[PDB]
Every structure is written in C-alpha cells, then in structure tokens.
Design a protein around this ligand. Structure first.
Ligand code: HEM
Ligand SMILES: O=C1N[C@@H](Cc2c[nH]c3ccccc23)C(=O)N2CCC[C@@H]12
Ligand SMILES: O=C1N[C@@H](Cc2c[nH]c3ccccc23)C(=O)N2CCC[C@@H]12
Length: 399
C-alpha cells in the first residue's frame, strides 16, 4: 500500500466507498490512481460536471481504451485470447451498422413489453402464494432475467447453457476472487460456446438479437462465424450480469423504502419516475466507464497525455451533491438533471429502453403487492465479492 489510491475501492455491497465522496470534494477534478489488477496508471473522475465534459468530448475514445495493451482497471483482458474483442466494430464492418439499436429500441420494446410484464406478474403472483421466506433473487430475478436473455438476446438456451454463460460472465467480469487463469478460461469457454452453437441458437424461432444479427443484410460477404460468436459474447457481458445485478439492487432499494412503495401502490402513474430514480440511486458497477485520450488535451485544467485513460465512476457522479440535492436520498419525485445510470454521450447504453422496460415491470410487480419486505436486515445480505456488476447472493423476503 502506497499513497496513491489503488482501484477499485472494494465496495461490493450497496454501501458506496466513502473514498468517492472524498475525491469529489478534494481540489483535483481528475485524480491519479493505480489499477490494483495490473498496476497501470489511470485517471479518476467523480464530479458530475467534469464527467459531462469528459463523456461528451469526441477526442476521448472508448474503443481505444478497450484495446489490448491499454492501461486498464480489469485484471484480465475482456476477450478470449486470439480474438479481437471488438464486437460493435465487427458488426459495423460487416454492414450491420444498426442491428443493435434496431433490436433494443422502442419498436423492439413494444414487441416484448407484454410478455415481460405478464412474466413479472406471473412470478410475483407465485410468490404471493408462498409461505414464510422466499428468495427474490432466485425466484424472481433469475427467471425474469433468464427469459430476457433467451427471448430478446440469444435464443432458446437450455438451463445448462444458461448456467454456463452466467458462470463465464461472473468469472470473467470480476476484479478478484478468482485466479488469472480461471478468468482467461471463462472468456475462452464463452467464445468457443458461441463458435459451436451461435448458428443453431440464431436459427431457433423467435426475434432474439442473435437471430436478427445472423439473418441481417450485409455489405459484401456473409457474417463470419468469429463475428457472430463475438456478438454472442457481447450480448452476454453487456446484457446478463448488468440486468440481473441491477434488478436485484433495485428490489433491495424498494424494500428499504416502504413509504416510496406505498406511494407507487397508490399512484401507478409515478412508476416511470421511480425507474429513473432507481437508475440514479441504485449502484451497479464497482468500476468505471473509461476513455482514452487520442491526443494531448486538458479537462478542467488537468493535462491528459495521448494514450492515458480517464475513468468516470457513474455511482460517484450519480451521488454528487453539486448535481442532486440530498443525493443519498431515494426520492422518486426528484426533478434533478439527467442521471448517469446508462452513461452519457455517444456510448449511452443502447439497451436502455429494454432495461427500462424490465425495470418498470419489476417496480410495478412490487408496487401492486403491499406487504413485501426484506426478511433480514440489509447489512445481513451477502454480496458476490469483486463482480464488476454488484449482485447479492440471495434476497430473503416475506409478506
Ligand atoms: C439495468 C440494466 C443496464 C444498465 C444499468 C446498463 C448500463 C450501461 C452503461 C452505463 C453503458 C455505458 C458504458 C460506457 O459508457 O462505456 C452501457 C453500454 C452498453 N449496454 Fe447497457 N446497461 C444495461 C442493460 C443492457 C442490456 C440488457 C443490453 C442488451 C444487449 C445492453 C447493451 C449494452 C451495450 C452493447 C453497451 C456498449 C455500448 C458501447 O460501448 O458503445 N445493456 N450500458
Ligand atoms: O461494448 C463494449 N463497451 C465497453 C463498455 C461496456 C459495456 N458493457 C460492458 C460490460 C462489461 C465490461 C465493459 C462493458 C467495453 O468496455 N467493452 C468491453 C466488453 C464490451 C465492450
Ligand atoms: O465494471 C466495469 N464497468 C464498465 C463500464 C460500466 C460502468 N457502469 C456500467 C453499467 C453497465 C455496463 C457497463 C458499465 C467497464 O468499462 N468496465 C471495464 C472493466 C470493469 C468494467
């Protein structure tokens, strides 16, 4: 341990590291840190106003910060050895410029919102018939996110396939708790799974994104097997632990705020505003979005050299009191500036409409059912240690 902070801050539960607020209030708008996993130098931004400037500046490149050899917070590269790890660009190069936005945008959500809301209701109606303590993680979030992944993303996976992909995601998308080789092997297993099965999965009936990608028109040649497999890996890493982690976290927020839930029960028209406040208030990533300077530049007076990587903690910015009065209060009626739960600028979450859809269905399922409560104190919830995307092991609950 030295005088420069190592990153990340080990805040694996919903309790955000106090270090973020300390850095926000310091005199440095951009703070040098060192990656615990690699020893690489990095910059860290925690103020909302600085983050807006960073994430809207085209001279900072997200893709450059994903390339092999970039200074990085993650201990192992987020790609199988020998692969590009460049899924969005490979789809763009094949001529599939829009298929991601097409399969996740408003028209796609209109196709899926019915069964998603019906399934949220079916799952919660089943819990309403249960005795004693039930687990919202295993018996609500798991089946709902599994259906999302199968029906909207990958196709009809078997339970063995789903468990394999979920294990790969949890093992690879981690700062600690597993060996280096275990993490590299997780990325290899996932890629080889999609080299073997992506064509078959894209051919199963439905409208899942993997099928849309495999069946889409292309400029020049047919989409390569490597590219389709890279698409499968992207959909897993971007859609699976994010959705499962966020839905678990959002449930915990709701259970810890019964007054807010009672309000949503009385005023269902307020549910969309509650979804937005959950995206601000509920922490998800334990790391940061990041961008590489493509040329020497200045941000809030701090000189960044070409090739250096600047991180923004979305959690830190979402809890910035310069942007959100009483930032650590869950306040669905809040009328603050735009939150950072989906990022900002060019790379704003392309799945944001689908995520909002599933979050809303979950909030409505809870709000319609008075009496749901956490069965244990929030400090007794057990958290998976080191995941990029926070997730509790279980959410014990009763009526
Ligand atoms: C509540 C759930 C989710 C949250 C909170 C979330 C959040 C985010 C955020 C903050 C980013 C920006 C990363 C950056 O700026 O570097 C992002 C990007 C992305 N998200 Fe979402 N996401 C969620 C669900 C999903 C789902 C279900 C999909 C389905 C495919 C998805 C697909 C993507 C992709 C492909 C990107 C990368 C965009 C790029 O790098 O240009 N996300 N997400
Ligand atoms: O599409 C990308 N975008 C960014 C951010 C990101 C979005 N979702 C992620 C999930 C895990 C890690 C990073 C991200 C990224 O770092 N990428 C590495 C793997 C996917 C690729
Ligand atoms: O934890 C991470 N977060 C994403 C960005 C992100 C922040 N919040 C998110 C929410 C959903 C998806 C991506 C993000 C990322 O780029 N990473 C590189 C290595 C660690 C990993």
């Amino acid at each position: 341990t030295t005088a420069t902070l190592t990153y990340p801050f080990h805040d694996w539960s919903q309790e955000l590291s106090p270090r973020y607020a300390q850095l926000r209030a310091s005199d440095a708008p951009v703070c040098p840190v060192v990656s615990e996993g690699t020893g690489d130098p990095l910059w860290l931004v925690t103020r909302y106003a600085t983050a807006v400037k960073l994430l809207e500046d085209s001279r900072f490149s997200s893709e450059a910060a994903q390339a092999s050899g970039a200074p990085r917070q993650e201990p192992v590269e987020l790609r199988a050895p020998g692969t590009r790890g460049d899924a969005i660009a490979m789809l763009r190069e094949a001529g599939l410029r829009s298929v991601l936005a097409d399969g996740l945008g408003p028209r796609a959500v209109r196709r899926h919102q019915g069964w998603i809301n019906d399934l949220a209701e079916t799952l919660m109606s089943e819990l309403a018939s249960r005795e004693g303590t039930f687990d919202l993680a295993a018996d609500f979030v798991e089946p709902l996110s599994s259906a999302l992944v199968s029906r909207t993303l990958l196709g009809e996976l078997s339970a063995d396939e789903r468990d394999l992909l979920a294990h790969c995601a949890d093992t690879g998308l981690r700062f600690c708790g597993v060996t280096h080789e275990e993490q590299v092997h997780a990325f290899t297993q996932m890629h080889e799974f999609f080299l073997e099965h992506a064509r078959r999965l894209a051919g199963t009936p439905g409208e899942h994104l993997l099928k849309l990608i495999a069946e889409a028109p292309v400029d020049q040649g047919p989409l390569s097997d490597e590219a389709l497999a890279e698409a499968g890996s992207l959909l897993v890493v971007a859609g699976f632990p994010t959705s499962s982690g966020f839905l678990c976290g959002a449930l915990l927020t709701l259970l810890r705020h019964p007054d807010a839930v009672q309000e949503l029960h009385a005023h269902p028209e307020r549910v969309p505003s509650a979804v937005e406040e959950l995206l601000r208030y509920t922490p998800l990533s334990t790391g940061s979005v990041k961008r590489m300077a493509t040329e020497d530049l200045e941000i809030d007076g701090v000189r960044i050299k070409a090739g250096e990587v600047v991180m923004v903690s979305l959690e830190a910015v979402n809890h910035d009191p310069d942007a959100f009065e009483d930032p650590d209060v869950f306040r669905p009626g809040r009328e603050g500036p735009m939150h950072f739960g989906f990022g900002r600028g060019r790379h704003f979450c392309p799945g944001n409409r689908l995520a909002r859809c599933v979050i809303e269905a979950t909030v409505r399922a809870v709000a319609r059912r008075p009496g749901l409560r956490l069965a244990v104190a929030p400090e007794e919830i057990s958290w998976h240690e080191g995941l990029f995307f926070r997730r509790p092991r279980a959410i014990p609950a009763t009526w």
